[PDB]
Every structure is written in C-alpha cells, then in structure tokens.
C-alpha cells in the first residue's frame, strides 16, 4: 500500500551535510510532488520544498532557499533531499510527504507520510 | 505563514474549535486542511479541504473554513486524542504553508 | 453528457453563491456568506438552461 | 520565418466606424504542463454514499483551453461607456484569432538552485475543435478568462469535462475523448497561428429599460425565487440557505435555479431584497474562495426589467396564488442584461426542441459558437534507458511555454433613433474625489473593477 | 528547413468515405543509444540456456526499428467496432510513413547530477528496407508497438536478429548485415523523413460467420490439440505442459506449434476448454511477465469457424481415428480471426514454393510487405587525446533523440449484402454500470484494454 521510507539516523557535526532518502513504494511516483517537512524541537512544521518527480526541478522556500538541494531517482525509485551546511539550529525530525489528490483535480493535500527521520547534529563526538 | 493559537485547552466529552487566520492571498484563495501530529510519529491527515474528512478519518473530526480564518472543531475527546494540530494551507506559487503548533491538553 | 453537468469539473466560477444564511446555532445570528461555486460543489452553480 | 525575427506585433485597440465596431485585444499566456502529460479519471467518492446531488464523474485532460468568452476581455472601460449609452442594440459579427511569439521554457534544477533555460526546438500543440466534437466547457462561465487588463501575464486553465454516471461509478453510455485524437497543427519558436469565424445571426442584444410600463398582452412568464433582505434582522433566523432552494431536479439529482427565468429583482423602492439564487453575483477583486462577507461581493439587479418581466419574489397572479407559470399566448417578456464581466456566448445544447435559447445568464445563445482552442506542450520525455522497456515512458522534461495573443471581434450597432425631448440616463463616473480612480491600478498594480456594468440605460416606448 | 521552424503537424484521424477508410495516427518516441554503440554478437550462452531447442545465433545491432504492426495502433476501438459491425471484410491499400520534428538530447553526468541540453548540430540516420535486403523481424509478433492510446510515448525497439547455428556456434553459411553499409537519410533537428507505399494485392479479410453448417464438400485440415481447461480441478493433476504439447519438429529442435492451422476452439457450447497452444492468450493489462496465473490473461477463441474448420480438440474423423490430415480435394476452410490487438501482416519467405501463404497468426501474409525502418543516432565522438592513436575511438556523448512519428494507411472495405430478416449479433459496450469505463483511462493513468475484439460478426449464407 502507498507508502513512504526514510532511512535510518545519522549523526553529523556541524558543518557536515547529509542527504535523507525516501522511497515511494506502491505507486506511480512520477504523478506526485513529494514535500519535506521539517520539525526542530519547539517549532512548528517547516516546509524544506517539493521536488516535482518526473520533472526533476524542486521549488524550495525562502528560508531554505541557499542551503538546501534535492536530487531523485526513478530507477531506484527514491527521492533525496541533501542539507549541506549542518548546524545546532538544523536538528529536527526529517518527513517526506506526498500530494495526494483523492482522486479528483480540484483537490491537494498531503495523504501519506514515510514513519520518521531523525538528524541529531551536535559537535560532540 | 498563518498565525494561530499555540496552546488550547481540553476536558473529556468536550469540543475543541481551533482557529487558524490568514491573509487574502495565502488562505482565501487556498483550502487550508489540517494535520493532526503526535510527537514520534508520522502527522495526519485529518481534514483536507475545509469541509471534508478522509476515508481513515473517524466521523466526529469536523472542519470550518471562512474567507481568511479557517477553524477546526473535534467532538467527543479524549486524552488518547490529544495531540499537536497544524493549519496547513497553499500559496500561488503552491508552497505549502504550516500556521503553528496547537497542541491540547485533556484533564 | 447531462444538461445538469454541462460543467468544467477543474475550474472554479466567477459567480458566487450564497452559501449560509446564519453563524451558528444561537440567537439573532442571521448573517449572510457567499462562496464560490466550483467543482467541489457542483450542485449550485449558475447553469444556462434548465429541463 | 526563423527564431530571431518576431512571429507577430501586439495589437490592442478599438475603431469606431459608423454602426460597426472592431475591438482587438492582446495578452500573455504561460501555459504550464498539467498532469504530467496523463489523461486521468476524476470522480468524487468521499463517502460510500458520497454526496446525493454533488456526485460526478468525467476525466481530465492536460490540454488548457482560451477563455475569451467573457465581454471585459474585449472592451476598456471606456469603450463600454462609450457603448451602452449611445446606442440601443449591437451583437458581434466576426471574430479573428492569432496566436502568435511562442516562447518554450526548460526548467533545470542543479546544485540546488533552478534555472530556467530557453527549449529552442520544443514545440506547442493547438487546435480548434470547429466541428464542435469536445465538450463544450466555455458556457458555464468558469473562471481563467483573458485579463481584463492588458498588462496581466495571465495563466491558461485545464480543459476537462464530464459524462454521465450513476452514483460515482459510470455507465456504458458515456464515452472518453481523446483530444490527441483530433489533428492539430504544432509550433516552434517561430511559428504563429490564426483564424478566423463568422457568428451565426442572432437577434440584437436588446440594450435599454421600457420607458412605458406594460400595464399602462401580458407580463411574461416567472418561477418563484425565495427572498433576502441584505440587511440580516429582516431574513429569518435560520439556515435557509439551502432547504430555501428553487430547485429544478433532474435524474433524482436536484439544481438550484441560477439565475433561472428573466425577472425584476425587486419590487418599486425595495432595492435591498435580492432573490436567493435569481442573480449573478461577482465577487470583487481579492474577494476570497469561501464564506466571503456579504460586502465582499457585487450583486447585479434587472430594475430595467420590470415593466414587462414579473418580480421574482412576488407570485405570479391568482385564478389561490399562482407560483409558477408558463407560457400562455400573448407575453411578452425582456431577457437577463448583460454585464461588462459577463460573459458574451454560451452554446446552445442540441436537442429536438428548445423554446427562447436565449441562455439564462445572458448573451447571444448559438448554435454554433466560436470553437474552443485546445493546447498542450508535445511531451519530451527524459533520458530513457538503454535496456528495452515494454512499458511507456514515466519520466519527462519540466517544461513550460508562454508567449502572445490577439483576438479581434466585429461588433455591429444599431443607434439611437429616439424622439424623447428631456435628456437620457448615461452612465458616468463621480467627479468626488477619491483614493484611487475607479478602474485603474491601485499602488500595488492591482487592477480592480469597483462596480458591474449593466447594458440598459437608453429608453424606448413599449 | 530550420531550427525555430516546425518540420511537420501532428495528424491523428479517421476519414470514413464510401467504401474505403483512412485512418491516420501519430505518437511521440525516444530513442536510446543501444548497445553502446556496437555490433555485438549473442548466443543462447551469453543470455545463459543450455538447451538445445533454445539454442540460437546472432548479432544485435544499435539500429532502432519502428513496429506499427498491430490493428491497435492504427483504428481506435470506436472504428474497430464501426469497422466490423457494418462490414463483410476489408484489406489495406496504401500505407503513409512520416516522422518528424528531430530533436537531439545530450545527458550529462555529473559527481550526484545529470542535466540534459540541446546539441542542435547533432544528427539522426533512418532508412527503409525497400528491397527487403536485410532480415524482417515484424513477422514474429513482438513488443514493442506504437503505443494504443496517443498521448503516450512510446520507447523504439533495438534491432537484432538470428542466423544460422550449430549449438551456439555459427556455420559458414551464417552471415551478417551490417546496416551501416545500407544508405540512409541524415537528419538534423530541421529535416523531417517520409515515404509512402502500397500493399500488393492480397485477399480480402473475411469477416463474418457462416450461418450454415458444412455438413448441411468436406471440412478443412486439422492437427489435434491437448485440451486444457480453466477448471482446473477437471485437468490431470500432472505436468503435462510440455510434454502435452504438439509440436512441429525441424532440424532436430522441437519447436512448439504455435498456434497452428486455424481450427475451433472448442466443441459448441462448451466454453472453458482451449487448445494448449492452440490460440492466443494476450496478456491483460498490469500483468507481469512470468508464471502468471490464469485470470491475468485474456484467451481468444476461435468458436465462429465451428462451422467449417474442425474441433481442435478434436479427431478429424475415422478411417482407426485420424489424429492430423492434410489437404484434401475439395476441402474448405476460414482462416484465423484478426484481433484488435493483434498483427496486421508478416512476410511470407522467400522460397521456391509454398502453400495458401496467409500467416497463422492472423493478418495479410505479403511477399513484399510493408518496409522496415530502422534509425539511430550517428555518435558524436568524445575529445580524442592531441596524439594519434590507430583505435577506435571508446568514449562517446551520452545522447538520446525524440520526435514525432505519423503514419497513414487506408484500409478498403466489402459491404453488407445480406437479405436476412432477423437481426443480428453486434459488437457494443455493455451499459451496466462499472468503477470504470471499459477501453479508457482509470484514475491511476494507465490505459487498459478489457477484452480482445474478433473481426467475425455479420453472418453470410455458407
């Protein structure tokens, strides 16, 4: 059934970048932007941007608009979104949610999202 | 970005309505929906549109939109529904625009 | 097709229709809200002919 | 020609000659690619009952389509002006369309930061369906119409349509159409496109109020609206909204009545009772999609009507009351006025009989309208693998492409004869002074129409 | 002619007139770099199956090769229904080849990106076969069709083929066809390709059903078939699949009888039987490709010939029963039933003789059929280093070129001339409602077709 997986955890200190993966498994994947959604610890939802499947070209936002890059591949069927400048304040749980329609033009909301991703950055060893 | 309440009082058997405003451009040319999170785990869809419910939606979970504030409103609570709920809406450019963490407190 | 659904199921109309004619449940709560017509209700919007 | 050298030249204008009228006008059209070049399936099931009378079912093509057919795409407000009080009726002619500086766009994503990069080879697919095949979808008065304003870069809409169905689920009378199946001529970056149709006679719009009241034959025919009192105390304290309605039901599936038959809005001096579904109702600009105050939006009133047209919230006459009547021998009745943001044709359905096609919301009901003009991007597919793969290609560019149109319609008028020796009522504007002139760009750049326009100023003897 | 210039327009059309039909369609393809640029040389051991029954020979070449040969691509099953209810057979006439609008595609690879980009100067080689010099793969029912539904875009074949083998060893008498020194066409991404053509004149199609029984002259041939049922609890519970099988035997490789002279499916009114390898089973669609269970695919039968050609479940007769017959004189015979998925025609080899050549598979069996046409991207080489080195250059850009391509045939057809008075069976949808509309697209986007059409409906006097 539709369904979204980010990988496992990663631990990097600031300064590193690391891309997240996220495989659509039980659909079409090219007919579905696919939005990442961000959490830091007190903060509301953040939106990193959408990448456009097929398309291959992202629309990121004016936060993120620098830092932030997305890549994807069909074959592997996974989508990637790379932060490469790291920090204290980038520490949050990553999501990667699809647009889902309801099968209908009109309509645009986010139906499913993968089970979780977790960046702990800390200079810490 | 939307401007909503951050924290919203709860008791058992009682409804909850949960405001959600913003400007012309943002939210009145644009559904808002409303995602139910849970620290943990992955948010959900609860309302998309702003009158319709989900198949996986149970049926007290109920929506209320008007011109720029767009409300919420859940029947029948309990403290094994309390949890975070966000105002998602849609621009013209279509990013997606997430009003606030409004988490309840049931007692 | 049907004369009733003569309609562009992706696009909204420009006409507005009026919508609720109260808030809420209460007392002296007339009030008057007016929408858009659009695919996701398609039962009030302005049509040429008619059965 | 080539790439360099320009595909066409920006017209807009208006001539005035004699007892005719030529109104070309020219705007900019980003056409993106709509569901990522895939016919696909639409219907509403959100609930195994779904909605009684909202149910529907039909697909939705990637082809968008021109909207012209509203009137304030052709004519500055001025020229309106200049239009509704000189003359007492007018009706288009011919119309002329070119379509012309495509410019296709590539969107390529690298190193996080997007550029878009002109395609010069990638080319743009259109035609005119002028046997009235496709579903006819411009009669329903949907919104992405040209601009009003010459300076919008405007964004073009979907095309897709409707068939019948029985719950959410359809039956074998309905039929899919392909709209790949039809020819259609594509451009490059150098090519235009242009033709041109005549309109099918239709009687003159009939611009101007009765100055003589009918009773002073008889009134034409009316179905009951219920009535609002814009002012809230007066309306009842209840949600009568929607059980309130003037409903027309057809396959077990109800329809409001909107606008329903020609009638007078109110009675003599009651300006603030409108029917509930008796108007067209604009909303003016940045009014928003929902449950928009009551201020938030225009209400047209056919006053001009009522000398021959019974009211709408009144009952008919008495034989007990009467609410709805027919057709007796001897009405007389005037059509529902046209309005500058109005739209101008609506197709008329093809059946085995019709009575007064006259469309309900106003303009010139035909036959045979002006064609719609379909268009999509031809679909350039990414890099497919060097293995053979029975399966069609899933992936394709991001692209998109813009570029210029001109559509010029010939207008023939018929002028003011009267013998009246006291003066005409004419539309003008106030001279009170005020923030910012009615119909021009406030100081964002937001061209915003402050009031309808209707057509019936000038009078005649009944 | 140039770059900003679109070379052709895409036609995509059904003309009916009189007694004769053209219907025209279009598609849009990419095509890869096969094979890296090489001619390369395959056995069964490079793809790794010892037996000797599979054992082959051969080379498989960069080339690309367009396949049209299936009736879905040309008629859309409106006509395939049009064109069989009111029709007592058909054949084709003139095929029109065209293809268009050339663009060239150069990806590239970075470190985590790939981004593509237009290399106008590049090239595209295509040529037709019109002597027939090369080897005709379209006569073995491949994949690989242009696309059922227009607005899909359809990936090209590679182009490869067998010779003569010993094991996976060649002979002496194996040779190979190197395309390069056929001549072709270079195309730009302003020059466009076309050519026409003209089927040698074949007989008709025969589509109908004998009313009349034979036998109320002999029936034609017959070759017996192990009958399997799609009950499956009636079949031996054994591996008979294989081993059941009849099968035609040459040069000591047992070779499946596939599915051989036409004969009925199964004896009138039983309808779950079928000859093991006697009719085709298309596969429906979503299946995949191995060790499918039953429901995914769609079983012809044959049942409109029970008339003439015998059971092939069945012995033709006694004499001690007779197991397979050849011709006799004075025998009768209908030939396999074109689907509309099924081939169009295939090439009747080259021999010194032959018998009633018209293939098994259905269709116009020709000695000049239609031209392959094969096309490729001429490699734009890589920088060679600044010092001569006698190899082959190794290192090529990374292309891809897409297009458009059209083709036009027309097909003739016989009328109805039938005196019968009652009516008769027509081939129509069937109007119960369905969570879909048979033959269109579902809300996921994918094109299926339920159901194979047969051509045999109208029925004639025997």
Same mark, same amino acid.
């Given at each position: ?125 | ?59 007290? @979970? ?35 625009? @997430? ?9 | ?25 209460? !007392?002296? !709560? !007339? ?13 009030? !919007? ?6 | ?17 004699? =007892? ?39 697909? +939705? ?5 021109? =909207? ?61 369906? +002028? ?116 409903? *027309? ?45 009551? =201020? ?36 007389? *009745? ?83 004869? +009267?013998?009246? *020796? ?41």
């Amino acid at each position: 059934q539709v369904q979204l997986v980010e990988s496992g955890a990663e631990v990097k200190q600031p300064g590193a970048s690391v891309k997240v993966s996220c495989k659509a498994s039980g659909y079409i994947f090219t007919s579905h932007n696919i939005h990442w959604v961000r959490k830091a610890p007190g903060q509301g939802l953040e939106w990193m941007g959408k990448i456009n499947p097929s398309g291959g070209d992202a629309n990121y936002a004016q936060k993120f608009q620098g830092r932030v890059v997305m890549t994807r591949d069909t074959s592997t069927n996974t989508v990637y979104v790379q932060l490469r400048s790291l920090r204290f304040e980038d520490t949050a749980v990553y999501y990667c949610a699809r647009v889902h329609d309801f099968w209908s033009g009109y309509h645009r909301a986010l139906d499913i999202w993968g089970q979780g991703t977790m960046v702990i950055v800390s200079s810490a060893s | 970005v939307l401007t909503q309440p951050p924290s919203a009082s709860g008791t058992p058997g009682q409804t909850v309505t949960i405001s959600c405003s913003g400007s012309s451009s943002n939210v009145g040319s644009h559904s808002v929906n409303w995602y139910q999170h849970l620290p943990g785990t992955a948010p959900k869809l609860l309302i998309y549109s702003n009158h319709r419910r989900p198949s996986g939606v149970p049926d007290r @979970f109920s929506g209320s939109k008007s011109d720029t504030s767009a409300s919420l409103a859940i029947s029948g609570i309990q403290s094994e529904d309390e949890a975070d709920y966000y105002c998602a809406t849609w621009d013209g450019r279509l990013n997606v625009l @997430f009003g606030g963490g409004t988490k309840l407190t049931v007692l | 097709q049907s004369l009733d659904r003569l309609m562009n199921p992706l696009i909204d109309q420009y006409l507005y229709y009026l919508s609720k004619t109260i808030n809420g449940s209460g !007392q002296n !709560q !007339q009030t008057l809200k007016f929408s858009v017509a659009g695919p996701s209700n398609m039962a009030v !919007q302005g049509r040429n002919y008619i059965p | 020609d080539g790439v360099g050298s320009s595909s066409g030249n920006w017209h807009c204008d208006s001539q005035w000659l004699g =007892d005719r009228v030529i109104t070309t006008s020219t705007r900019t059209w980003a056409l993106p690619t709509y569901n990522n070049h895939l016919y696909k399936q639409i219907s509403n099931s959100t609930s195994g009952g779904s909605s009684n009378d909202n149910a529907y079912f039909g697909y +939705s093509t990637p082809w968008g389509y021109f =909207d012209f057919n509203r009137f304030h795409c052709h004519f500055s407000p001025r020229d309106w002006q200049r239009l509704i009080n000189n003359n007492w009726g007018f009706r288009p002619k011919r119309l002329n369309f070119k379509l012309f500086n495509i410019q296709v766009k590539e969107v390529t994503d690298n190193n996080g930061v997007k550029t878009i990069a002109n395609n010069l080879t990638s080319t743009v697919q259109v035609f005119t369906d +002028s046997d009235y095949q496709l579903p006819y979808v411009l009669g329903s008065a949907h919104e992405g119409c040209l601009p009003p304003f010459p300076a919008d870069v405007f964004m073009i809409p979907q095309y897709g349509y409707l068939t019948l169905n029985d719950g959410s689920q359809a039956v074998g009378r309905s039929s899919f159409y392909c709209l790949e199946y039809f020819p259609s001529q594509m451009l490059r970056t150098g090519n235009n496109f242009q033709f041109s149709y005549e309109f099918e006679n239709v009687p003159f719009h009939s611009s101007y109020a009765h100055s003589q009241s009918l009773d002073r034959y008889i009134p034409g025919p009316s179905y009951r609206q219920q009535r609002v009192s814009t002012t809230v105390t007066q309306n009842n304290n209840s949600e009568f909204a929607w059980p309130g309605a003037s409903s *027309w039901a057809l396959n077990g599936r109800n329809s409001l009545m909107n606008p329903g038959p020609a009638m007078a809005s109110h009675k003599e001096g009651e300006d603030r009772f409108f029917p509930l579904s008796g108007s067209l109702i604009f909303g003016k600009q940045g009014t928003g999609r929902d449950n928009v105050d009551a =201020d938030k939006v225009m209400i047209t009133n056919e006053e001009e009507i009522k000398t021959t047209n019974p009211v709408a919230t009144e009952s008919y006459g008495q034989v007990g009351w009467v609410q709805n009547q027919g057709i007796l021998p001897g009405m007389v *009745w005037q059509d529902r006025d046209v309005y500058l943001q109005g739209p101008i044709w609506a197709k008329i359905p093809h059946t085995d009989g019709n009575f007064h096609p006259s469309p309900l919301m106003g303009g010139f009901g035909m036959k045979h309208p002006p064609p719609q003009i379909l268009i999509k991007n031809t679909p350039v597919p990414a890099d497919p693998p060097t293995a053979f793969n029975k399966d069609k290609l899933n992936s394709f560019i991001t692209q998109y492409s813009t570029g210029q149109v001109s559509v010029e319609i010939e207008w023939e008028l018929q002028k003011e004869n +009267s013998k009246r *020796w006291n003066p005409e009522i004419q539309y003008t504007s106030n001279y009170y002074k005020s923030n910012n002139v009615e119909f021009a760009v406030n100081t964002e750049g937001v061209y915003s129409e402050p009031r309808p326009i209707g057509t019936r100023y000038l009078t005649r003897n009944l």
